[PDB]
């Protein structure tokens, strides 16, 4: 359909034009709002007082990585070379080679933490359900020699909290 | 000990102009819905001791391209005519008694803009060059709006001194009778001293940063402490020239008490604006003075001249 | 003797408690910088007043992606800043370039161009791991200007 | 089990910043020359 | 109209650098990965260059 | 073993170490090892933040920092244990109010000529100066020619180096002049006689090392560094005013880091051009650089535009 805005004409009669000459010359407008709508300061401030208080999130949040393990640990990753092949940024790097018993596992697993674009494509391709984006924004170290991760940085970083992780998926896994 | 009455003035004021900068962002804080500098204080009241000390540690570069002889005599001012102007200003007892002194402000109101033209030119090219030129041009066209509407009332009080101007406002708060003028006494000092709604001189929007752009932490405390030594004075004036208190030959002290609970309300006006209104685009900025502000100010002068004469009113002075 | 090391509980507490950060808007990451100065998480008034001119700053901040044609601009601006300067990159594109890291017209990494100090990792860092990236930099002044004059 | 007891931090140099390394076995296995006899 | 016939064997110069004369390209029909029997990965004549050293970082 | 091409993010098989490497010279060498690939372990004394302006020098995981004192015989033994070549630029100007300066050219260059020799470094290197002669001169210039004698005993293979008065970008040699806005230029000592020395440009010296850094076949065999042509005039002090058209300091200021009314004034006029028989440069070359052309760059003053020289 339509509408027309800013289409109006002044009335042009001496009952009006005072009302527009009691405005220009006496400032009866322009004190209407910012004489007032500004104050209106008397509302409670809204601030999350940071070092202590913190704000909301959701169980589907994304962040620092992990590699779980079952009960008594198997290093849940089977090195099926997938979370590697859907990765848009191509951070992941994986090198398998048959472990002594003959069950296969990894050797090098490196997520670069600069390239990773935080998809949620590597949480959703792993069929054996290993690699999982943690909900901890712990980060920010002082040397780029660092953020590159090896395998045996990840596991700890994913065994430091599994009380966080293992209780999110069981909220979220019923939807997908 | 007359020398210890002076130095008791220059020092105790540099604390206000310091601790204004804090109440700058608390009051302007809760307009935004938030709290003001908080973490460091505990209340924040301790912020400005940490800020005064970061600058003078922080290295004061000069442009390789500057003329150093001007790059000093200019700021060696922005802190004089700001601290001299305070001298003859009754509260209630002014340090000096100047016969005709009211006129002496305009002497020192007129001689500061000749410290802008130096600095912005002293340094270098087009952000402070033609950018410090055309803030000259607006600063001198808001005097003719001024000296007249200062001269109006002085027909209504009799003389040029300030000891009479407490007597005449006795039981009449001089803002009734000329309330049309009083408005224009306000938009002037806000337009002349480069504050919020006509903001252009110091740049944010129209340019990068006006006139401050070159000075690093070293000199730039002075201006940032000079520009706030005018603003709390004209506003510590307006309220001796309009909203009068009642002298008390007995408890002088209750004069100033009730006097800073006015001049300190009044000031909190250039902060209560700055949250609110936008800028003027330098055409509209002067283009609204000649056409609009001025014709009245003449017309009223033809009025406050006759009103005493036409009522046998003529105020008792020479 | 001991006066110096007690003096640096002043000057090394002054420079950390008032910062005048420049910012670079370039790319997505700029908006999750704004919301640090919006009232929720309120950047200013926690000690750090927001943007000033290039000359008056201390901590510049790099958001966004740095192409070829922006490099000649940055390296110049980083200079003019006064002494006590730092560089805190943020976002997954100042760390080695997000993606675009294989492109032709993106510099790879923005450490290459300047001596960067603190990092933060992810398309937009969540407006949180920003401030917890600064409460690293206000804790990264434990340094002392003693023990240069006063040892050697 | 298979999870920690107390905690750690993200620290800048603790002294321990972890500074990653390579996790793999060698590559080409260069030849050894023969010993003392001609 | 300026039709101006002539013959000069088309060549172009300056856009790449030294990789004009250093290398030798190759034009070959891909061979069908043999672990599977799908015959559809054939049929287009591609080209691909010589391989130079990849080292370790 | 060297791989690939020398651009960056390459190997080229040499480790290194560079002691000092904060002030004028050392910063300007490592910058030539943050290119051709290396492992440059740069230690440093007291300075946490003054070393940052360096870091975008090696690519990533190349240069790596440690902390050391140097009168502790361990601090030099913890680093070098893994190294190939190790050069040494250490030492400075004026006697410190703390370090008595006597053996800091004697004990320090030996203190790092401790287990370095033992632990199996190789191609160890040290610095000398073209003008240092064990005859009596000059209070600072002396103790430097002691190292050529005293220290050369240890590590029979050195290839210890002997360059001239050098002019860099941020250097203090030719910059003591033109800072002389003052009661007037007064030459040393008010005589136009023996100026000037062999003013080689800082690139060529810092391209000498890395040309000897795997040379090969220069070890024990010391070299000295030719200047350009040829000796020079008094005009050098006029030349300054011909074109000029007339770390870890403090927070506020430094009490004393002076012009030193001492060796400083007499160290600049000591001249003594010395033995040609040292190989010493083109052999290690190929480099030699003039003055007249390269002295505009480092000199820029309050005209900043006009030259017409
Ligand atoms: C950058 C560093 C180098 C600069 C350092 C020095 C800078 C000095 C700058 C001077 C700026 C202020 C000068 C303004 C003069 C104002 C004088 C004045 O208006 O005083 C008013 C008063 C009037 O007298 P009245 O009140 O009518 O009668 C009293 C009867 N008992 O008058 C009186 O009471 C009598 C006057 C007594 C004062 C003697 C004259 C003083 C004025 C001399 C100023 C010299 C000019 C200096 C340069 C000015 C440049 C702006
Ligand atoms: N070959 C030449 O042409 C020539 C000319 C002039 C002087 N020299 C001498 O040859 C070398 C060239 O030095 P330079 O050009 O790089 O200037 P420099 O400013 O002396 O550089 C020396 C660096 O090492 C530091 N240092 C001083 N004493 C030290 C010590 N005992 N132990 C460890 N570090 C020390 C200095 O301060 P920090 O301790 O804070 O690091 C500085 O960082 C020096 O020994 C110099 O005295 C040579
Ligand atoms: S997690 Fe899924 S994808 Fe990542 S490696 Fe183990 S199996 Fe392959
Ligand atoms: S996180 Fe996002 S980017 Fe990093 S790997 Fe998984 S998908 Fe690819
Ligand atoms: S990564 Fe950070 S910078 Fe690169 S695009 Fe996503 S947001 Fe903008």
GROMACS .gro file of C-alpha atoms in nm, chain F residues 61-199:
model
  139
  802UNK     CA    1   5.970  -1.849   1.709
  803UNK     CA    2   6.306  -1.725   1.585
  804UNK     CA    3   6.446  -1.471   1.825
  805UNK     CA    4   6.405  -1.562   2.191
  806UNK     CA    5   6.489  -1.360   2.503
  807UNK     CA    6   6.656  -1.443   2.833
  808UNK     CA    7   6.771  -1.244   3.137
  809UNK     CA    8   7.126  -1.218   3.265
  810UNK     CA    9   7.365  -1.008   3.473
  811UNK     CA   10   7.710  -1.104   3.345
  812UNK     CA   11   7.918  -1.102   3.659
  813UNK     CA   12   7.745  -1.428   3.748
  814UNK     CA   13   7.940  -1.702   3.576
  815UNK     CA   14   7.622  -1.907   3.537
  816UNK     CA   15   7.410  -1.659   3.339
  817UNK     CA   16   7.647  -1.690   3.043
  818UNK     CA   17   7.654  -2.067   3.084
  819UNK     CA   18   7.280  -2.132   3.074
  820UNK     CA   19   7.217  -1.988   2.730
  821UNK     CA   20   7.514  -2.055   2.505
  822UNK     CA   21   7.523  -2.430   2.568
  823UNK     CA   22   7.330  -2.476   2.242
  824UNK     CA   23   7.488  -2.244   1.988
  825UNK     CA   24   7.688  -2.228   1.671
  826UNK     CA   25   7.854  -1.890   1.642
  827UNK     CA   26   7.852  -1.628   1.911
  828UNK     CA   27   7.960  -1.273   1.853
  829UNK     CA   28   8.011  -1.011   2.122
  830UNK     CA   29   7.948  -0.638   2.097
  831UNK     CA   30   7.925  -0.580   2.470
  832UNK     CA   31   8.069  -0.273   2.639
  833UNK     CA   32   8.000   0.096   2.621
  834UNK     CA   33   8.117   0.453   2.687
  835UNK     CA   34   8.164   0.629   3.023
  836UNK     CA   35   8.261   0.461   3.348
  837UNK     CA   36   7.949   0.376   3.543
  838UNK     CA   37   7.882   0.485   3.899
  839UNK     CA   38   7.840   0.110   3.963
  840UNK     CA   39   8.058  -0.083   3.718
  841UNK     CA   40   8.411   0.045   3.771
  842UNK     CA   41   8.477   0.007   3.397
  843UNK     CA   42   8.830  -0.126   3.438
  844UNK     CA   43   8.772  -0.493   3.351
  845UNK     CA   44   8.432  -0.464   3.180
  846UNK     CA   45   8.647  -0.487   2.868
  847UNK     CA   46   8.864  -0.744   3.050
  848UNK     CA   47   8.657  -0.958   3.286
  849UNK     CA   48   8.323  -0.940   3.099
  850UNK     CA   49   8.455  -1.037   2.752
  851UNK     CA   50   8.639  -1.312   2.931
  852UNK     CA   51   8.345  -1.397   3.155
  853UNK     CA   52   8.168  -1.484   2.829
  854UNK     CA   53   8.499  -1.623   2.701
  855UNK     CA   54   8.440  -1.865   2.986
  856UNK     CA   55   8.249  -2.185   2.916
  857UNK     CA   56   8.171  -2.068   2.563
  858UNK     CA   57   8.521  -2.191   2.484
  859UNK     CA   58   8.460  -2.494   2.706
  860UNK     CA   59   8.106  -2.581   2.599
  861UNK     CA   60   8.182  -2.604   2.227
  862UNK     CA   61   8.078  -2.283   2.061
  863UNK     CA   62   8.270  -2.204   1.748
  864UNK     CA   63   8.358  -1.901   1.540
  865UNK     CA   64   8.342  -1.694   1.859
  866UNK     CA   65   8.384  -1.323   1.781
  867UNK     CA   66   8.469  -0.997   1.961
  868UNK     CA   67   8.506  -0.630   1.871
  869UNK     CA   68   8.809  -0.401   1.862
  870UNK     CA   69   8.855  -0.044   1.744
  871UNK     CA   70   9.080   0.097   1.472
  872UNK     CA   71   9.237   0.349   1.705
  873UNK     CA   72   9.309   0.148   2.023
  874UNK     CA   73   9.685   0.122   2.082
  875UNK     CA   74   9.846  -0.011   2.400
  876UNK     CA   75  10.080   0.286   2.410
  877UNK     CA   76   9.961   0.549   2.643
  878UNK     CA   77   9.618   0.652   2.523
  879UNK     CA   78   9.339   0.687   2.580
  880UNK     CA   79   9.187   0.629   2.924
  881UNK     CA   80   8.875   0.481   2.766
  882UNK     CA   81   9.045   0.389   2.440
  883UNK     CA   82   9.282   0.189   2.659
  884UNK     CA   83   9.157  -0.132   2.823
  885UNK     CA   84   9.006  -0.203   2.482
  886UNK     CA   85   9.344  -0.290   2.331
  887UNK     CA   86   9.395  -0.508   2.638
  888UNK     CA   87   9.122  -0.743   2.514
  889UNK     CA   88   9.313  -0.782   2.187
  890UNK     CA   89   9.605  -0.893   2.405
  891UNK     CA   90   9.454  -1.034   2.726
  892UNK     CA   91   9.152  -1.209   2.578
  893UNK     CA   92   9.304  -1.337   2.252
  894UNK     CA   93   9.489  -1.586   2.472
  895UNK     CA   94   9.168  -1.781   2.512
  896UNK     CA   95   8.984  -1.916   2.204
  897UNK     CA   96   9.270  -1.931   1.950
  898UNK     CA   97   9.004  -1.890   1.677
  899UNK     CA   98   8.841  -1.547   1.693
  900UNK     CA   99   8.855  -1.334   1.378
  901UNK     CA  100   8.825  -1.042   1.614
  902UNK     CA  101   8.726  -0.732   1.424
  903UNK     CA  102   8.874  -0.383   1.400
  904UNK     CA  103   8.651  -0.113   1.248
  905UNK     CA  104   8.676   0.266   1.238
  906UNK     CA  105   8.462   0.555   1.358
  907UNK     CA  106   8.113   0.461   1.226
  908UNK     CA  107   7.814   0.677   1.140
  909UNK     CA  108   7.473   0.513   1.166
  910UNK     CA  109   7.125   0.650   1.184
  911UNK     CA  110   7.069   0.692   1.561
  912UNK     CA  111   7.444   0.671   1.631
  913UNK     CA  112   7.620   0.898   1.882
  914UNK     CA  113   7.945   0.942   1.688
  915UNK     CA  114   7.864   1.201   1.422
  916UNK     CA  115   7.564   1.312   1.629
  917UNK     CA  116   7.772   1.463   1.910
  918UNK     CA  117   7.820   1.733   1.650
  919UNK     CA  118   7.511   1.929   1.541
  920UNK     CA  119   7.392   1.882   1.899
  921UNK     CA  120   7.655   2.146   1.964
  922UNK     CA  121   7.420   2.445   1.949
  923UNK     CA  122   7.619   2.607   2.219
  924UNK     CA  123   7.855   2.900   2.280
  925UNK     CA  124   8.002   2.795   1.947
  926UNK     CA  125   8.157   2.513   1.759
  927UNK     CA  126   8.499   2.461   1.917
  928UNK     CA  127   8.696   2.184   1.742
  929UNK     CA  128   8.928   1.950   1.929
  930UNK     CA  129   9.125   2.112   2.049
  931UNK     CA  130   9.050   2.433   1.860
  932UNK     CA  131   9.265   2.287   1.581
  933UNK     CA  132   9.175   2.183   1.227
  934UNK     CA  133   9.465   1.942   1.194
  935UNK     CA  134   9.403   1.568   1.226
  936UNK     CA  135   9.029   1.529   1.141
  937UNK     CA  136   8.908   1.298   1.026
  938UNK     CA  137   8.905   0.924   1.079
  939UNK     CA  138   8.769   0.655   0.846
  940UNK     CA  139   8.393   0.710   0.862
   0.00000   0.00000   0.00000
